[PDB]
Amino acid sequence: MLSKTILDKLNHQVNFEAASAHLYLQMSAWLLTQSLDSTAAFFRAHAEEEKAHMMKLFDYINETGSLALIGEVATPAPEWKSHIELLEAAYNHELAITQSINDLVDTALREKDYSTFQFLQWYVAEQHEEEYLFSSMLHKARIINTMDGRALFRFDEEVRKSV
Amino acid sequence: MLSKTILDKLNHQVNFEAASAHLYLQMSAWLLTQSLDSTAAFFRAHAEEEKAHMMKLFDYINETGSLALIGEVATPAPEWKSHIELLEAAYNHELAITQSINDLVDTALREKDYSTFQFLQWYVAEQHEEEYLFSSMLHKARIINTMDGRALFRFDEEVRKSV
Amino acid sequence: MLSKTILDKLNHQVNFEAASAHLYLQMSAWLLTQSLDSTAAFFRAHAEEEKAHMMKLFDYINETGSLALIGEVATPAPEWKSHIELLEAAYNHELAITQSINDLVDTALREKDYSTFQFLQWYVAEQHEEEYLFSSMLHKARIIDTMDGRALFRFDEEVRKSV
Amino acid sequence: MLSKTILDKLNHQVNFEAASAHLYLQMSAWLLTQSLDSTAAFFRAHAEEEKAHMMKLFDYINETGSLALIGEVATPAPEWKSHIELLEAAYNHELAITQSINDLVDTALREKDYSTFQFLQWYVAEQHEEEYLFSSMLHKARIINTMDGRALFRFDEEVRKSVL
Amino acid sequence: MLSKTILDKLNHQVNFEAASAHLYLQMSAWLLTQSLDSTAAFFRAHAEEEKAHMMKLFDYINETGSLALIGEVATPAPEWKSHIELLEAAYNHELAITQSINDLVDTALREKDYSTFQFLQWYVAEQHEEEYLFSSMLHKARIINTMDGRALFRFDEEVRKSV
Amino acid sequence: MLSKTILDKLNHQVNFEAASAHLYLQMSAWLLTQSLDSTAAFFRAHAEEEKAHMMKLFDYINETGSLALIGEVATPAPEWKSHIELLEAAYNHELAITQSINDLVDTALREKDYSTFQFLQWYVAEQHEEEYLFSSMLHKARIINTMDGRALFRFDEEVRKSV
Amino acid sequence: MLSKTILDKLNHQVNFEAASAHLYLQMSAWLLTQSLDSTAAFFRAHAEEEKAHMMKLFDYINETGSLALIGEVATPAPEWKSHIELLEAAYNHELAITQSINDLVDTALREKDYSTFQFLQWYVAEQHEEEYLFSSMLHKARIINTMDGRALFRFDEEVRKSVL
Ligand SMILES: [Fe+3]
Ligand SMILES: [Fe+3]
Ligand SMILES: [Fe+3]
Ligand SMILES: [Fe+3]
Ligand SMILES: [Fe+3]
Ligand SMILES: [Fe+3]
Ligand SMILES: [Fe+3]
Ligand SMILES: [Fe+3]
Ligand SMILES: [Fe+3]
Ligand SMILES: [Fe+3]
Ligand SMILES: [Fe+3]
Ligand SMILES: [Fe+3]
Ligand SMILES: [Fe+3]
Ligand SMILES: [Fe+3]
């Protein structure tokens, strides 16, 4: 049976993952106005990943006998001036999610709620994959924004085809 | 291409469908605290249906060249005192969705936006199925809440097995 | 070839079977307003059986070289005050159909129309199955209307599952 | 949920489709007395189509929470003096059904019952296929009733075998 | 070659198993007049099992070179005032069959007819299964005859569905 | 629905078919003592046919809403001095069954119980097959009991093999 | 390799899981005397799960080079006055198993026996599933023990058949 401090943080995380899904949907919509159709598709698909993260928390909470709460989710209209600004926002958002998961893990360990600690390892692992994915996409966007960079990528693509 | 009045209403509907998904998730969670597991599963699954309704609007808006907006979605904590009160809320919520769709259809017809009019016919048909589903579930819940009612259903179940 | 007296009775039976189909359709519609969905489905399906009874008579008449006549079919609006009253009506109606078939069989025998006599044996057999079906459904409805009865059926269902 | 005016018209249509099924059964029976066996089979099969039209209305009404009503269906005995007179009756009947559907669509639009309006679009489409089917069958009957017409159809049949 | 005392008892058992089949048929018929269709089907199917018990004794006797005798089988008309009274009769009847088999086994052992002793082990085993089946059905009928009992079974059924 | 006179006769027939099964079982057992193993197998199998005749009547009676009654079945010990005497008894027994079915058919026709009349046509047809079977077996037995007869059959068997 | 304090606790847990299996067998036997056949079958099957929990600990201990010990397992005769009292005992028993596993995890962490810590994560996860299972079964039993409760479940079952 979940302590109140852990419950509140798990419910905060449910709400955070829900907000991520909506954020990525909104990014997708903006990207389509820039004709960045593949990046839009990526964010659309990834919104569906964030919905799965949400549901898995939601279920764990309910299975423990507490009541999961969705809360308020507010998605700001698209401010972004360029695709790089959007990718920076996405990456920082994923860093903040990782922070939140780490806090949650730390507090489960501190309260000796080992059940929540082991449940959260899935998220710790997933956030490693998320940071890798989003940092890497940002890094490429910055490179591809330069002519020297576009030449590097042309070589890399030649290697992908030739060998 | 989309007029501002229609765009604002379509985006309102996007947000309304998003709120429905979250509302039904929240109902599902509450139902699990009552040990109403099958009803909880129904609402969980239906939250996924509302998400599909949302995405289909979202796409139509983006395909027309406008920018779909998710907005703010606020889900109140579970007030419900019984499963009947929750079913009443779900049914009324579906009526309100139908109202909103009808207002949208009416306004498309009035502006001679025939493209949005025909796109919405899917929703007009879907809301007929939704009202049937939720009214019927509420009616049964009220009947099953009385002893006379539980006797009717016992006969109906005998007919389902016997013939 | 068919005598006028036998033709007029066969055409009466065509019309009677048509009226039965419409009756059972109407009963189905009423049962849906009571939320007796399985009973409604039974009466809907059975309306299709009555249509088959009709068509088989209709074809026999036409094959003999006479002209089958549908006539007027009038279905009274739903009077029924309970599902038991409806089942009583259905059972009495099936008794009347059997009476009508028996009169028809008797008159074919009396006129030595052995062809019509043998054609009707299918109906004599079918009406035995109909009476069994409808009497049995009525009997169960009367039993299930009592608390003692619902306890008997709970045991019978335990036997269906256990052995 | 359904307004009374729409409910009454949908129930009228239920009854009208039921009367069509019976009408076409009766036509089938008459056609058999003329040894027009294929035309009889067509009308028999089409009576089954009219039943499906009926049931679909019936179900929509019941799904909305109202009570569908079958009503009285009266089928006059076969008056018809020729197959052409019968085909004219069938075609006019189908024109009347279309009228009745159009009235129903128009009244749903006027009351802003968009749910009934969209449900009826199936019927609007179906009645276009019905008018095409019956008008075309009538037209061919009139042509075939003339010697010049039979010659046209003999050529058309030669094309069906030789090329198409 | 069978002793006269063993032969007479084996033939008595043949007749007893025959009487059981007829008894269970008669019970089946009565149960149908109470609309206990599943219990009726059980007794009908079980009459077939008793016939198989009869035939297996019948064959053993004939294979040893003696002449199996069916004898007189008298089945009283249905006295039963309730399904529980009928189940009590069925259980007691099975207890009497077991007694009769045990007497038969005991006599074979006493006369050192080891062939008949080993043949009868099948029946000893089968009667354990019969007593389990019939005692269990009686017990459940008594429980289900009460409101507290019907609540226990409702929980048990929930466990059958949930886990 | 069944008249008392028809019910009593149907229940008589139930009992008669039951007695036939037991009679043929008893004949089978006697035949085995004469080493007539194939004839014994025929009677054993045919006892199963008589059980089916019984069950079909039993079911019809119950389906009409009356209570089928098995009654007393008494099987005399085997008197038979030869296989021919047994075959004569079997044939005469089948003649008596046919008589009993005919009386039953005649009574149904007289009371205008057309439902029982048509149900019985199956038995009228089956008894034609039964009389053919048993008369033919008796006739062959009488022929084979003579040396002239065994010579005829030796020729017939030659024709079965040669052509 | 295993410290004596960890070894003694792992062997205690081996013995605890063995006792659980026997407890659930004994509950199964009692439930059969009440004609609660499905609940009996559940406890019987679950005794087999507890045996698997036992064997997995037993194997880990042996793989580390220490000697696993079964010990004494004593199963009291069935005291239970109702199925609810039995389900309460089962649930509390599972809570006590969780407590032991948590103590074991906690002491592995203190001693920096990370190997035993990671091995035990399986049990931490499993005991979450166990508590869910048993608490939920208890909660339903309490609800079904009331007439209002049986009415709720009748509705829930209608939803299982009609929609889900
Ligand atoms: Fe996430
Ligand atoms: Fe993420
Ligand atoms: Fe929706
Ligand atoms: Fe909806
Ligand atoms: Fe009929
Ligand atoms: Fe009928
Ligand atoms: Fe039509
Ligand atoms: Fe039409
Ligand atoms: Fe036996
Ligand atoms: Fe037995
Ligand atoms: Fe027979
Ligand atoms: Fe026979
Ligand atoms: Fe365990
Ligand atoms: Fe456990």
From TrEMBL, chains A, B, C, E, F:
Taxonomy of the source species: Bacteria, Pseudomonadati, Chlorobiota, Chlorobiia, Chlorobiales
First and last residue shown, out of the full length, are: 1 to 163 of 203
Similarity remark? Belongs to the ferritin family. Prokaryotic subfamily.
| E.C. numbers | 1.16.3.2
Instruction: Using the record's annotation, list all stretches that form the Ferritin-like diiron domain.
Output: 1-145
Cellular compartment(s): Cytoplasm
Q: What is this protein called?
A: Ferritin
One function term, GO molecular function aspect: ferrous iron binding
What is this protein's gene name? Answer: ftn
Q: Which reaction does it catalyse?
A: 4 Fe(2+) + O2 + 6 H2O = 4 iron(III) oxide-hydroxide + 12 H(+)
Q: Where does this protein hold Fe cation?
A: 17, 50, 53, 94, 127
For the biological process aspect of GO, one term held by this record is: intracellular iron ion homeostasis
Chief place where the protein resides: cytoplasm
Task: State where Fe(3+) 2 binds.
Answer: 50, 94, 130
The protein's role, per its UniProt record: Iron-storage protein.
